[PDB]
């Protein structure tokens, strides 16, 4: 449950105060809430979480690996595909 909530709240907002995090993500100690966040790759700086960190890092990794040019498809690639379908 906590991980499911943790994923959904990244989209919702960039920041939740420390107190609002504890209630949502179901803990009984404010020190556990902070530790969980550090391991999960959100920095608490100024008692505001930054959900955006992990999201940027996951995304950076997908761009790091390469399969990548064809899946998205270039402009040049779309137009080359039209002409050759015809011409068979």
- Decide whether 16 or 44 has the Cβ nearer to other proteins: 16
Q: Do the beta carbons of residue 51 and residue 14 sit within 8 Å?
A: yes
* CA distances in angstroms from 17 to 14, 27, 55, 60, 62, listed in the order given: 10, 15, 19, 26, 30
At closest approach, how far in Å is the CB of 38 from other proteins? Answer: 21
Ramachandran bin of 32, using left for φ above 0, alpha for ψ from -120 to 50, beta for the remaining angles: alpha
Residues 7-46 that bind other proteins (CB under 8 A): 7-9, 11-13, 15-16, 20
Given the rule CB under 8 A, which of 3-11, 25-33, 36-44, 56-64 is the region that contacts other proteins? Answer: 3-11
Count of residues engaged in binding other proteins, rule: CB under 8 A? 20
Between 2-12 and 52-64, two packed helices, what is the crossing angle to 10 degrees?
90
Contact residues for other proteins, defined by CB under 8 A: 4-5, 7-9, 11-13, 15-16, 20, 73, 75, 78, 80, 82-83, 85-87
């Amino acid at each position: 449950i906590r991980d499911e909530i943790a994923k959904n709240t990244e989209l919702s907002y960039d920041f939740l105060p420390l107190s609002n995090i504890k209630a949502l993500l179901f803990f009984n100690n404010e020190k556990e809430t902070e530790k969980f966040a550090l391991e999960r790759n959100w920095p608490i700086v100024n008692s505001k979480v930054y959900f955006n960190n992990q999201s940027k890092e996951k995304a950076d990794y997908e761009d790091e690996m390469m399969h990548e040019e064809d899946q998205k498809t270039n402009i040049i690639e779309k137009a080359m595909d039209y002409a050759i379908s015809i011409e068979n």
